[PDB]
Amino acid sequence: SMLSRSPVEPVQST
Amino acid sequence: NKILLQCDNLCKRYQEGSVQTDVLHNVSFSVGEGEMMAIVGSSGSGKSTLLHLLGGLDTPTSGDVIFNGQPMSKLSSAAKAELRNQKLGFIYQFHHLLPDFTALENVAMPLLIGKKKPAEINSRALEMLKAVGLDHRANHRPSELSGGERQRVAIARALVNNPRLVLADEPTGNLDARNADSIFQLLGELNRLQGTAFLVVTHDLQLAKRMSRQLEMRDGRLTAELSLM
Amino acid sequence: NKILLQCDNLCKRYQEGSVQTDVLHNVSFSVGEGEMMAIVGSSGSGKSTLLHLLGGLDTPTSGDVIFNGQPMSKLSSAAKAELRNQKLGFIYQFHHLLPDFTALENVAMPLLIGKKKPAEINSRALEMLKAVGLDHRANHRPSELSGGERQRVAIARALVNNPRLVLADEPTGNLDARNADSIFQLLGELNRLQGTAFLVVTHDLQLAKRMSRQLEMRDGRLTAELSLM
Amino acid sequence: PLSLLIGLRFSRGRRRGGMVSLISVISTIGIALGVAVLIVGLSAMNGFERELNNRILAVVPHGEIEAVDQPWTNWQEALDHVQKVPGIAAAAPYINFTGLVESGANLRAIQVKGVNPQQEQRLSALPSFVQGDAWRNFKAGEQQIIIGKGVADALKVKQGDWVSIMIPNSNPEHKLMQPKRVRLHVAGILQLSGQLDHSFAMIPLADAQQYLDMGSSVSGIALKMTDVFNANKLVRDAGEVTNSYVYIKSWIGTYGYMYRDIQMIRAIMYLAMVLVIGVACFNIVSTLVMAVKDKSGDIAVLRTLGAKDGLIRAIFVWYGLLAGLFGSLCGVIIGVVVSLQLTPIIEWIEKLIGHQFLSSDIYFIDFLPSELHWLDVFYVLVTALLLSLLASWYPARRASNIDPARVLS
Amino acid sequence: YQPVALFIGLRYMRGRAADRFGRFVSWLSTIGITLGVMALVTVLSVMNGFERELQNNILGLMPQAILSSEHGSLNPQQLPETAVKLDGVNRVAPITTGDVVLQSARSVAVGVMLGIDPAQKDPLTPYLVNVKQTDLEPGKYNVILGEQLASQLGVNRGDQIRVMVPSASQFTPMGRIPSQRLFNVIGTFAANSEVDGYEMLVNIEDASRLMRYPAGNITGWRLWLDEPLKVDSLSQQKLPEGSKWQDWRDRKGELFQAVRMEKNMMGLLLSLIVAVAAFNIITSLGLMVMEKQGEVAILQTQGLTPRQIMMVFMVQGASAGIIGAILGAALGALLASQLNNLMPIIGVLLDGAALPVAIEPLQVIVIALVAMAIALLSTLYPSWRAAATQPAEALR
Ligand SMILES: CCCCCCCCCCCCCCCC(=O)N[C@@H](CO)CSC[C@@H](COC(=O)CCCCCCCCCCCCCCC)OC(=O)CCCCCCCCCCCCCCC
């Protein structure tokens, strides 16, 4: 919600 | 006879029924304007409660006090404050000084509440300080003062506004002779020139005997009420 | 000679400079174990402050007090508390009791401070109640009690642990004759059996004539020093 | 008790009722408010943790192994090699498509998962969350599809309804045109949480394999841990067992924001409510300072009997500590009465105030949960007592070193 | 002349220099109010910065308002842009918005198509990577996808994706056929935002023709707002005849609503602090009156009215509240917009911006005034009791 600003794509699939 | 002040059955009750001791019943006083009335008695004999009631602080349980037809109880509290400020001078047993305020501020407090202009009141205060000679101690704290000094500050505060009735409950009880002689001289010229009524209760028989009028409140009975003239 | 306490030029000052009064100079007193000393004098003649100083509540302004070679100034407060709780008994002028505790608790407190086991203090309180006869006071509140009773409970609290030094500042002021005779008898058997020294300061000259030893502090000179035995 | 019981009599010695007992009531109200609301917050976030443990992380694949170049030719060997890795509770194959779900002129683009029912039963507690379905008749080769509640209500469909599924099946040849339009039968409705039911839709794995006309292969392997908080390195090691060309994914990367949000909110609650208890301890400091200034005579009477310089301090420390205990217990009572009826309380608030709180699918649970862990209550009460003692310590030291006779005269 | 009670009230707050602790006890209420207002100001500024980042990352890159026609599409000739004037709106540009399904050779997804004129810049234009905005010529069917949307679709530059709209579907005996068209991707938009996951950019002519709109028409006018979060108030304005107003609340409203409700919550969760601090003031007076009644009696023997004793105590309470609130707001402003300096020296958990800070002076003033009002409400009662209670009854 408020901190929704999470980097939507942090995956960096190894 | 008396029209200015009419006191009828001044009584105070703060207990329940059948537990109140029959100490006083139908006690009336003759208070006259212009006369310096003195009351004699011993400490702890129920003399302070009546004088605290006489100041208009509390409403008497029984009896009426009439000033030319105007009851105090139906009268507004602002008029009561006016009476306590410019008509009546009241002193407690103790010094009851204000530690947060300086001696000069405590002395000027009766005028300060009176909403008077700073110029003339400060001029009169400075003239009185010069006449007394106590200009040196102006910024010092009341806490570090002696009993006689603070007692005389209280007396001066009581005499700032020149009230018609100046009520003094043993004003020299905590005073030594060095201050007592000056206080008595001050009272002497105040009585000679100003003539303001003083209600001075003091224990010394010799000093009180010289007075024209002597009233005695002992055991709640009207025992001695003597007027030479 | 006295070994537990050594007093040299005991003096007390309670004021700052300038207004300081030079009323006392080189005044030392002789306190002997087993003897009941009485001090007489008028009001305001330094009778209460000196009695306060002997209890270790404050440090003396001038003079030296030696307790078994340990100076009081370098002595820790724990030792002074131990002295005040186990060896010295002090009685105030006024009632100065604890309004929240019962009379039994006020009597028990001196040994409760001493971290003693509850059993012996409870037994002592019960024995005191049985021997004296305060079983009638089972429904009344300690706050609403009389003055003589509370003063005598203060005395009993001062006599719980039988201190060597029992200082009594006016022990009979609030006690009537029916209590006064009993207190005098109690003091009699305490002095006969326990032998604790009593420092009784009281104002009535006629009754103080009955004390074993009478000492006079007048004009800064040791003039009258009478010891019957 | 101990010889410090004076404090009790110093606390129960209240007379002249009014503006001397109202002070204790106000201090108790402050301490109780802070402690009770802190306990309610902590219990609510414990309930949030429990609900996340049940609804979300117990149905999602804890680990994800997806071949990037070609569909898994030897998924069986990799599955057997990874199932024996310690720290892994279960494993299963799956195939992940995405296609056009259509019914009643309503169309959506939804992701579809194909998994063997008997294997996904061991893989997660997801089938236990189905509202109602035939657990025995649900099998492969029956044109059976199971749809989440969100997709079902957005499609205005119910159980036992036919649905069209469009799949691209694009190929380099001319077969890429005319996308496959298969038919499926809805057999169950999922109710996971506020967000997960809007995306999950399952078909049997053999049905998916027949729908793509592919061989015995799957698009990935799903993994269920025994311990979930360290799933990153665990799934990395599990994938290291198989070929290195595969892509690994952990549920941590997707749902660790939920963990860190729950921990951050709990920390914020604890810090703010420690501030609240600190203000109430300012109240306690004021009350004890007035207590010293009113019982200076009594402490002098105590000291003239041989009291130690730490005894009076102890009296007032326990005075403050008992004033703290009264409010802390009066707040713990509310924090236990609430946090056990917290959900009906929130429902009643919703009835009173027509405003929905945790719904609107931008969170993971429409309602507000609650779970009272008594360890949290113990921690809160110890925090309150420690703050009260820190408040009480300095007025006690002030009381210890004052003699009224020395300073007044 | 000032009221006399001001002097006495301001003088009781000071003194007691022989111990330096009673003054601290009297200022405990001010310290508590200061701490509460500090926490409120700094946390509200932090949450305002977080929602500002959401606004500049979610709403800043999507149509903030849309003015359309009541029935069907909008006719630009019927409603010229020159007549589109409203409050809070600083820029208006033609746009067509649609909900679309994108089918690739590898996967399928759902997204939002934004048909715009290349000649006018958009907040999405600075983020375009190796893709000229003017390259979206009409008839070329040019589409720019978001980075996350492209990854979901599994396509890149030079690959074609089938874009379909079900809202413009045609019913026939062969079922319902949504409108379909092949689009050529020429790049990706990198914004690192939720909007990049579903929003794609196309030429306005191609999209307008795709939705089965008559040639030359557009879906509506995209309106930028200086304060879009108050759009509901701007939703009540007078609109041009025959037009309807829609905003982001249709799609991303609940989220933002929740955010506000969150902010508001942590808005009471810390406000309770000053509420408790308000109670603290009561206790202070409930003690200080008890510590100064013997002086009030003297002030009662003089000309002070009981209604003026209530003034002299309420002014002390109010002075404590005002000093606490003002100093707390000042230190909150001083501490906010500086946490991004203190965070580096310790371990940092967040990535990128340390802590967004958006200090709105209106919020700070409103909460300071609310704290002052609560302080006055708290100090009203003990002041009244001190005024109404004669010294004799308390002493006797
Ligand atoms: C009362 C009605 C019930 C309402 C229910 C509401 C529940 C919503 C939240 C639930 C969380 C769910 C978990 C998943 C969250 C998520 O996925 N994602 C994220 C969604 O965005 C969570 S953001 C987390 C928010 C939540 O805000 C909340 O905390 C709401 C808590 C409420 C939880 C409900 C339980 C019941 C308690 C009710 C409390 C009210 C008491 C009533 C009193 C009478 O915190 C934040 O604001 C993020 C933090 C940003 C601020 C950082 C501050 C930086 C500090 C800098 C240092 C400055 C110096 C300071 C000292 C001077």
What resolution (Å)? Answer: 3.5
Residues E116 and E231 in one domain: yes
Of E118, E122, E165, nearest to E142 by C-alpha is: E118
Q: How far apart are CA C194 and CA C87, in angstroms?
A: 13
Chains with ≥3 Cβ pairs under 8 A against C? D
Q: How far apart are the first and last CA of chain B?
A: 17
Sequential DSSP letters for E274-326 = HHHHHHHHHHHHHHHHHHHHHHHHHHHHTT--HHHHHHHHHHHHHHHHHHHHH
Which residues does E308 contact at the CB level (< 8 Å), separation at least 6? E3, E4, E5
Residues D204 and D318 in one domain: no
For a ligand 1 pocket test, name from D29, D259, D262, D265 the mutation site with the most ligand atoms within 8 angstroms of its C-beta: D265
Which residues does B168 contact at the CB level (< 8 Å), separation at least 6? B91, B155, B158, B198, B199, B200, B201
Residues D48 and D115 in one domain: no
Three-state DSSP class for E86? Answer: coil
Of C229, C161, C162, C159, nearest to C195 by C-alpha is: C162
DSSP B212: S
Count of domains observed in chain E: 2
Half-sphere exposure of D299 (CA within 13 A, CB side): 27
User: Which residue in this structure is represented by tokens 């503006």?
Assistant: D19
Three-state DSSP class for B79? Answer: helix
Residues E269 and E343 in one domain: yes
Is E342 part of any domain?
yes
The strands making up C213-216's β-sheet, listed across from edge to edge, are C88-91, C165-169, C197-201, C37-40, C213-216, C225-227
What percent of the residues of chain E are helix, what percent strand, and what percent coil, each to the nearest 5?
A: 50, 20, 30
Q: How far apart are CA E267 and CA E283, in angstroms?
A: 25
Q: How far apart are CA A1 and CA E53, in angstroms?
A: 12
In 10 A of CB E335, how many CB atoms? 16
Is E181 part of any domain?
yes
Chains with ≥3 Cβ pairs under 8 A against A? D, E
| Phi then psi dihedrals of residue D210, to 5 deg | -70, -30
Question: How many angstroms from the chain centroid is the CA of residue B191?
Answer: 15
Q: Tell me the CA distances in angstroms from D270 to D32, D46, D128, D261, one per residue in order.
A: 15, 13, 36, 14
Residues D21 and D88 in one domain: no
Residue C19, class by beta-carbon neighbours within 10 Å (0-12 exposed, 13-18 middle, 19+ buried)?
A: exposed
Q: How far apart are CA B186 and CA B152, in angstroms?
A: 11
User: Which residue in this structure is represented by tokens 């109202």?
Assistant: D22
Tokens for D147, please give them.
């749809």
Which residues does E318 contact at the CB level (< 8 Å), separation at least 6? E372, E375, E376, E379
Q: Which atom of ligand 1 is nearest to the CA of D268?
A: 29
Of E25, E355, E43, nearest to D272 by C-alpha is: E43
* Torsion D8-D13-D18-D23 (CA) sign: negative
Whether B47 has a binding-site annotation, put simply, is yes
Q: Does residue D288 contact residue D316 with C-beta atoms inside 8 Å? A: yes
CA angle C104, C106, C110 (to 5 degrees): 115
C58:D406 CB<8 A: yes
Residues D146 and D195 in one domain: yes
Beta bridge partners of E146: E189
Q: Which of E192, E218, E247 is the last residue of a domain?
A: E247
DSSP E331: H
Count of domains observed in chain D: 2
Q: Does residue B171 contact residue B151 with C-beta atoms inside 8 Å? A: yes
Q: How far is E362 from chain A (nearest CA, A)?
A: 21
Q: How far apart are CA D48 and CA D313, in angstroms?
A: 44
Query: Which residues constitute the domain of residue E379?
Result: 4-55+263-395
Is E345 part of any domain?
yes
Q: How far apart are CA D311 and CA B39, in angstroms?
A: 50
Task: Write the Ramachandran bin of B56: left for phi over 0, alpha for psi from -120 to 50, otherwise beta.
Answer: left
User: Which residue in this structure is represented by tokens 């420390």?
Assistant: D317
- Are there at least 3 beta-carbon pairs closer than 8 Å between E and A? yes
Residues E35 and E73 in one domain: no
Sequential DSSP letters for C39-103 = EE--TTSSSHHHHHHTTTSS--SEEEEEETTEETTTS-HHHHHHIIIIIEEEE-SS----TTS-H
Residues D195 and D88 in one domain: yes
HEC string of B126-188 equals HHHHHHHCCCCCCCCCHHHCCHHHHHHHHHHHHCCCCCCEEEEECCCCCCCHHHHHHHHHHHH
Measure E265 CA to ligand 1 centroid, in angstroms: 6
Residues D264 and D397 in one domain: yes
Residues D70 and D204 in one domain: yes
Q: Tell me the CA distances in angstroms from D208 to B9, D133, E380, one per residue in order.
A: 110, 20, 74
Tokens for E346, please give them.
């310790």
Is D247 part of any domain?
no
What percent of the residues of chain A are helix, what percent strand, and what percent coil, each to the nearest 5?
A: 0, 0, 100
Residues D94 and D205 in one domain: yes
Q: Which atom of ligand 1 is nearest to the CA of A4?
A: 21
Tokens for D292, please give them.
């010293």
Q: Which of E199, E215, E247 is the last residue of a domain?
A: E247
Which residues does E311 contact at the CB level (< 8 Å), separation at least 6? E3, E5, E9, E383
Q: Does residue E1 contact residue E307 with C-beta atoms inside 8 Å? A: no
Is E347 part of any domain?
yes
Residues D95 and D214 in one domain: yes
Residues D116 and D37 in one domain: no
Question: How many angstroms from the chain centroid is the CA of residue C139?
Answer: 31
HEC string of chain D equals CCHHHHHHHHHHCCCCCCCCCHHHHHHHHHHHHHHHHHHHHHHHHHHHHHHHHHHHCCCCCCEEEECCCCCCCCHHHHHHHHHCCCCEEEEEEEEEEEEEEEECCEEEEEEEEECCHHHHHHHCCHHHHECCCCCCCCCCCCCEEEEEHHHHHHCCCCCCCEEEEEECCCCCCHHHCCCEEEEEEEEEEECCCCCHHHCCEEECHHHHHHHHCCCCCCCEEEEEECCCCCHHHHHHHHHHHCCCCCEEEEHHHHHHHHHHHHHHHHHHHHHHHHHHHHHHHHHHHHHHHHHHHHCHHHHHHHHCCCCCCCHHHHHHHHHHHHHHHHHHHHHHHHHHHCCCCHHHHHHHHHHHCCCCCCCCCCCCCCCCCCCCCHHHHHHHHHHHHHHHHHHHHHHHHHHHCCCHHHHHC
HEC string of D352-371 equals HCCCCCCCCCCCCCCCCCCC
DSSP B96: -
Measure D59 CA to ligand 1 centroid, in angstroms: 26
Tokens for D66, please give them.
């997806």
Residues E165 and E284 in one domain: no
Q: How far apart are CA C210 and CA C38, in angstroms?
A: 10
User: Which residue in this structure is represented by tokens 């002075």?
Assistant: E319
Q: Does residue D290 contact residue E290 with C-beta atoms inside 8 Å? A: yes
Residue type, B113: I
Cβ-Cβ contacts under 8 Å, E276 against chain D: 30, 33-34, 276, 279-280
Mutation choice for D interface testing from E276, E289, E374 by most D CBs within 10 A: E276
Tokens for E219, please give them.
């879906």
Residue type, E256: F
Of D266, D252, D130, nearest to D186 by C-alpha is: D130
Residue C170, class by beta-carbon neighbours within 10 Å (0-12 exposed, 13-18 middle, 19+ buried)?
A: buried
Strands B165-169 and B88-90: parallel
Q: How far apart are CA D45 and CA D369, in angstroms?
A: 8
Is E255 part of any domain?
no
Of D409, D298, D364, D355, nearest to D9 by C-alpha is: D298
Q: Which of E247, E277, E296 is the last residue of a domain?
A: E247
Residues E165 and E289 in one domain: no
Is E253 part of any domain?
no
Cβ-Cβ contacts under 8 Å, B98 against chain E: 295, 298
Three-state DSSP class for C30? Answer: coil
Q: How far apart are CA E344 and CA C171, in angstroms?
A: 74
**Which residue in chain A has the smallest CA separation from D265?**
A3
Three-state DSSP class for C212? Answer: coil
Which among E196, E259, E351 has the least Cβ separation from residue A2?
A: E259
**Which residue in chain B has the smallest CA separation from E2?**
B115
- Are there at least 3 beta-carbon pairs closer than 8 Å between B and D? no
Which residues does C28 contact at the CB level (< 8 Å), separation at least 6? C7, C8, C9, C10, C63
Query: Which residues constitute the domain of residue D375?
Result: 3-55+258-408
Q: Does residue E332 contact residue E42 with C-beta atoms inside 8 Å? A: yes
E303:B113 CB<8 A: yes
**Which residue in chain A has the smallest CA separation from D254?**
A11
Helix E306-335 vs helix E22-57: crossing angle, to nearest 10: 50
What percent of the residues of chain B are helix, what percent strand, and what percent coil, each to the nearest 5?
A: 35, 20, 45
Is E257 part of any domain?
no
Is D264 part of any domain?
yes
Strands D180-190 and D144-148: parallel
**Which residue in chain E has the smallest CA separation from A7?**
E192
Minimal-distance CA residue to ligand 1 atom 11: D262
Q: How far apart are CA D168 and CA D177, in angstroms?
A: 8
Q: Spell out where chain C has E strands.
A: 6-11, 37-40, 62-67, 70-71, 88-91, 165-169, 197-201, 213-216, 225-227
In 10 A of CB E205, how many CB atoms? 19
Q: How far apart are CA D256 and CA B152, in angstroms?
A: 78
Is D212 part of any domain?
yes
Half-sphere exposure of D256 (CA within 13 A, CB side): 19
Q: How far apart are CA D87 and CA C23, in angstroms?
A: 93
Q: How far apart are CA C93 and CA B98, in angstroms?
A: 28
Measure D327 CA to ligand 1 centroid, in angstroms: 25
- Are there at least 3 beta-carbon pairs closer than 8 Å between B and A? no
Q: Does residue D164 contact residue D102 with C-beta atoms inside 8 Å? A: yes
Q: How far apart are CA D76 and CA D78, in angstroms?
A: 5
Q: Does residue B182 contact residue B151 with C-beta atoms inside 8 Å? A: no
Of D376, D319, D369, nearest to D340 by C-alpha is: D369
Q: How far apart are CA B34 and CA B164, in angstroms?
A: 8
Is E60 part of any domain?
no
Protein residues with CB under 6 Å of any ligand 1 atom: A 1-4; D 37, 40-41, 44, 48, 258, 261-262, 265, 268, 357-358, 363, 368; E 38-39, 42-43, 46-47, 262, 265-266, 268-269, 272, 339
* Chain B touched by E297 (CB under 8 Å): yes
Whether C44 has a binding-site annotation, put simply, is yes
Three-state DSSP class for B1? Answer: coil
The dihedral over CA atoms of E220, E224, E228, E230, expressed in degrees to the nearest 10, equals: -70
E166:D278 CB<8 A: no
Q: How far apart are CA C114 and CA C81, in angstroms?
A: 10
Q: How far apart are CA B119 and CA D65, in angstroms?
A: 94
Q: How many Å is the maximal CA-CA distance in chain D?
A: 111
Q: Does residue B197 contact residue B180 with C-beta atoms inside 8 Å? A: no
Q: Tell me the CA distances in angstroms from E36 to C183, D31, D33, E275, E278, one per residue in order.
A: 62, 16, 15, 9, 10
Q: How far apart are the first and last CA of chain E?
A: 38
Residues D178 and D222 in one domain: yes
Helices (DSSP H) in E117-248: which residue ranges? 147-153, 204-210, 231-234
Q: Does residue E219 contact residue E208 with C-beta atoms inside 8 Å? A: yes
Residue positions counted in chain B: 229
Mutation choice for B interface testing from E295, E302, E390 by most B CBs within 10 A: E302
Three-state DSSP class for B64? Answer: strand
Is D239 part of any domain?
no
Of C229, B219, C219, B100, nearest to E18 by C-alpha is: B100
Which among D19, D30, D99 has the least Cβ separation from residue E276?
A: D30
Three-state DSSP class for E105? Answer: coil
Chains with ≥3 Cβ pairs under 8 A against E? A, B, D
Is D248 part of any domain?
no
Of D179, D217, D192, D97, nearest to D145 by C-alpha is: D97
Which residues does E82 contact at the CB level (< 8 Å), separation at least 6? none
Residues D162 and D141 in one domain: yes
Breaks (C-N over 2.5 A) in chain C follow: none
Residues E86 and E212 in one domain: yes
Q: Tell me the CA distances in angstroms from C5 to C68, C88, C132, C144, C160, one per residue in order.
A: 7, 12, 35, 41, 23
Q: How far apart are CA D300 and CA D303, in angstroms?
A: 5
Q: How far apart are CA C156 and CA C160, in angstroms?
A: 6
